[PDB]
Design a binder for this molecule. Structure first.
Ligand SMILES: [Mg+2]
Ligand SMILES: [Mg+2]
Ligand SMILES: [Mg+2]
Ligand SMILES: [Mg+2]
Ligand SMILES: [Mg+2]
Ligand SMILES: [Mg+2]
Ligand SMILES: [Mg+2]
Ligand SMILES: [Mg+2]
Ligand SMILES: [Mg+2]
Ligand SMILES: [Mg+2]
Ligand SMILES: [Mg+2]
Ligand SMILES: [Mg+2]
Ligand SMILES: [Mg+2]
Ligand SMILES: [Mg+2]
Ligand SMILES: [Mg+2]
Ligand SMILES: [Mg+2]
Ligand SMILES: [Mg+2]
Ligand SMILES: [Mg+2]
Ligand SMILES: [Mg+2]
Ligand SMILES: [Mg+2]
Ligand SMILES: [Mg+2]
Ligand SMILES: [Mg+2]
Ligand SMILES: [Mg+2]
Ligand SMILES: [Mg+2]
Ligand SMILES: [Mg+2]
Ligand SMILES: [Mg+2]
Ligand SMILES: [Mg+2]
Ligand SMILES: [Mg+2]
Ligand SMILES: [Mg+2]
Ligand SMILES: [Mg+2]
Ligand SMILES: [Mg+2]
Ligand SMILES: [Mg+2]
Ligand SMILES: [Mg+2]
Lengths: 129, 218, 88, 18
RNA sequence: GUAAAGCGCACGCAGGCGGUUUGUUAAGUCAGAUGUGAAAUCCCCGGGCUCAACCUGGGAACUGCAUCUGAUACUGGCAAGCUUGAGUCUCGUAGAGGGGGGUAGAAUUCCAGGUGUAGCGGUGAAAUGCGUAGAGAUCUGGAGGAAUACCGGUGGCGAAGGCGGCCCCCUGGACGAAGACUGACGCUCAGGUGCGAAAGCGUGGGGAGCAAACAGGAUUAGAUACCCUGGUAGUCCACGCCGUAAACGAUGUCGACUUGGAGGUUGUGCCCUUGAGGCGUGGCUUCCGGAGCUAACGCGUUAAGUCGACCGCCUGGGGAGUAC
């Protein structure tokens, strides 16, 4: 949190999912909003909304198809003190393509499939499955 | 004042955190269950029970409570189904082979009593044996009719009779239990936010389910 | 601890306006005044380790504030130090 | 020692009160 | 945490990492192109030795480096910002927090006086010891040193080690209500610096009680060993050194997220505080226990659960935390 907001939001999502919480809230930021949009686009979450202007807050609605959680696992990849960058020809694959790996390329934040299609490398934010 | 609107509730102070949304809040120092949001799920359970009774399923009743023993025995005899008036024997479902052997032994003893036990050999020893076996005959009043293998259960409590719920879950038998406000709702797949006290309320519930199952065969 | 009157005088003399207690210059002035006041007490006693720990804490805080002020504005830092006679 | 008996007595703090 | 492994604790330089908006910088990063990366060898498709080994043609590869052209979401640099992190100001609260100086009561020992007279002390039983030059007992004065019964509590404070009579002077930290202010000023820290139980050492004082060493008694054929009577350092003070503990919660520091109950201890807001009470909201702290974790024990919102930053440490037992 004080040093890794991305890891903090990922941890919040994991804890909320394990605790069977309808939704979670966290401080909002541009990178956090982009990550939330990417997750929603892939169906990992229901919806995200930002409330407030001076101190914006990001609220994410978790999804449960059945009693088990839809987000089986979420793991940070690139963290402060150890940055991970991959070329377009060696992008990581999650669960033999069944998972989603968040990649930040020069065109923004997108799934690994989009980066491979666009042939652009970048920073691996995290693995989601 | 509907059927579920008569009882006041239960779970005075200590509560199970699992069923948080099923409690309206704390009123008059005692928590109140979501009485308004109780009739849909119960109706769904009744519909499921009717579906089960469509095939004439072997749905059982648990009467471990002395106060409710007759309250559930009347419904059991009205529906001519199986019931457990006395303490639920551990392993009745999982160890059903032992129960089958016991009921077979009881049937053999009952059949042979009229011929051999009465006066063929002795009477004093036979009288003592009959007196000893009368309690066994009283036990397993309904479950001894057929081979068992129940397709559902209607236990009146969860925390008190968690053994039955655990056995059903192990055997994958759905349970239409009226979970108490302070019990564990994880075991029961058809949790009903009802009440355990107010003998009149539970009597009305068992009467209603008996009426529904009676006409559930179409 | 520093008296209320002393704190008010320090704020008035260093703060850019009323209720300017949060300015870095005011904080540095209060810390250095407290350090100067406690120097005599420590010399008199010389065995108050717990109070010496508190003195060290305030000295470290003042050094950090001075470094931040120097990084943010050289003119403000160089004027404050000569006014307070610090950084020998 | 004059201190061990005190510690032994204080050990019984958790006997049956808490 | 208990198998090897969290420095005794804290502060802090270098270093590592760092909240949120924009602006452009294109260093890291990414995309393309160019030059180079010897041949042989490895790999793919073929060919020639009757097959194979072996030889051989063309590729691929050589994961690298340098230069140029572009993208800039992310990280970094530069310039402005923002207040949530971190701090300052105002009021009040509890506290064996620390340093210095006073003073009070009980008790032990010693000195002296009165009354009184043969024992007292000790042990499992004794003896050494004290006593007729009068003990012990009791009383009445005085001297001295050390420690603070009751309160006292799984109570409180302190970073740790530790801190208990009462009062005064100096002084540190923490917490709560409501505001105002500064605007990332932050976190962690190898070396470095400081603190650090008891024992011990150097100098000079003090010395009631206790007590290593030592003496004697008893026991034994004789011993040693517990036991008894004494008793020197030590224990206390001022300064300086020592820097070691099962210095333990065998759990490094900081931040975020995650079902619940029963207390204790300090705040504070509201309802008739009528009061003790009810309704809430903070800080610290004790016990049970859910998910989760764990080899199990067990931990469990004060995690040993889910993560992030940094530091320290460990990889068989003995040798050995020993030798140099
Ligand atoms: Mg104070
Ligand atoms: Mg060990
Ligand atoms: Mg430690
Ligand atoms: Mg530190
Ligand atoms: Mg540093
Ligand atoms: Mg930096
Ligand atoms: Mg940043
Ligand atoms: Mg570049
Ligand atoms: Mg390139
Ligand atoms: Mg080559
Ligand atoms: Mg930038
Ligand atoms: Mg004090
Ligand atoms: Mg104080
Ligand atoms: Mg002194
Ligand atoms: Mg005296
Ligand atoms: Mg404390
Ligand atoms: Mg401002
Ligand atoms: Mg060090
Ligand atoms: Mg000492
Ligand atoms: Mg010596
Ligand atoms: Mg000495
Ligand atoms: Mg001496
Ligand atoms: Mg001897
Ligand atoms: Mg002795
Ligand atoms: Mg002695
Ligand atoms: Mg050590
Ligand atoms: Mg200790
Ligand atoms: Mg240790
Ligand atoms: Mg053990
Ligand atoms: Mg526990
Ligand atoms: Mg462990
Ligand atoms: Mg070894
Ligand atoms: Mg050595």
């Amino acid at each position: 949190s004080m040093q890794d907001p991305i890891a903090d939001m990922l941890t919040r999502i994991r804890n909320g999912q394990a605790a069977n919480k309808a939704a979670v809230t966290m401080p909002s930021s541009k990178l956090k909003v982009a990550i939330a949009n990417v997750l929603k686009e892939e169906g990992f979450i229901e919806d995200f909304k930002v409330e407030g202007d001076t101190k914006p807050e990001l609220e994410l609605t978790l999804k449960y198809f059945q009693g088990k959680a839809v987000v089986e696992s979420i793991q940070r990849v690139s963290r402060p003190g150890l940055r991970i960058y991959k070329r377009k020809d060696e992008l990581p694959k999650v669960m033999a393509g069944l998972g989603i790996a968040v990649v930040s390329t020069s065109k923004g934040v997108m799934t690994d499939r989009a980066a491979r299609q666009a042939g652009l490398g970048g920073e691996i934010i995290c693995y989601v499955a | 004042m509907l059927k579920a609107g008569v009882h006041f509730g239960h779970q005075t102070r200590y509560w199970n955190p699992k069923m948080k949304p099923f409690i309206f809040g704390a009123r008059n120092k005692v928590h109140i269950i979501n009485l308004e949001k109780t009739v849909p799920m119960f109706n769904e359970a009744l519909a499921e029970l009717n579906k089960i009774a469509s095939r004439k399923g072997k749905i059982l009743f648990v009467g471990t409570k002395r106060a409710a023993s007759e309250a559930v025995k009347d419904a059991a005899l009205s529906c001519d189904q199986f019931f457990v008036n006395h303490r639920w024997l551990g392993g009745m479902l999982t160890n059903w082979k032992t129960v089958r052997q016991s009921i077979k032994r009881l049937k053999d003893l009952e059949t042979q009593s009229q011929d051999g036990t009465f006066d063929k050999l002795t009477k004093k020893e036979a009288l003592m044996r009959t007196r000893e076996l009368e309690k066994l005959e009283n036990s397993l009043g309904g479950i001894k009719d057929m081979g068992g293998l129940p397709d559902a259960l209607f236990v009146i409590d969860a925390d008190h009779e968690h053994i039955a719920i655990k056995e059903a879950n192990n055997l994958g038998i759905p349970v239409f239990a009226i979970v108490d406000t302070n019990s564990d709702p994880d075991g029961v797949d058809f949790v009903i936010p009802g009440n355990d006290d107010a003998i009149r309320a539970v009597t009305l519930y068992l009467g209603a389910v008996a009426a529904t199952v009676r006409e559930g065969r179409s | 601890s520093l008296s209320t009157e002393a704190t008010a005088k320090i704020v008035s003399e260093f703060g850019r306006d009323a209720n300017d207690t949060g300015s870095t210059e005011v904080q540095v002035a209060l810390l250095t005044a407290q350090i100067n006041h406690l120097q005599g007490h420590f010399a008199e006693h010389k065995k108050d380790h717990h109070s010496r720990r508190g003195l060290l804490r305030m000295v470290s805080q003042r050094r950090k504030l001075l470094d931040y002020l120097k990084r943010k504005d050289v003119a403000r830092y160089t004027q404050l130090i000569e006014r307070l006679g610090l950084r020998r | 020692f004059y201190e061990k008996p005190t510690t032994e007595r204080k050990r019984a703090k958790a006997s049956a009160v808490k």
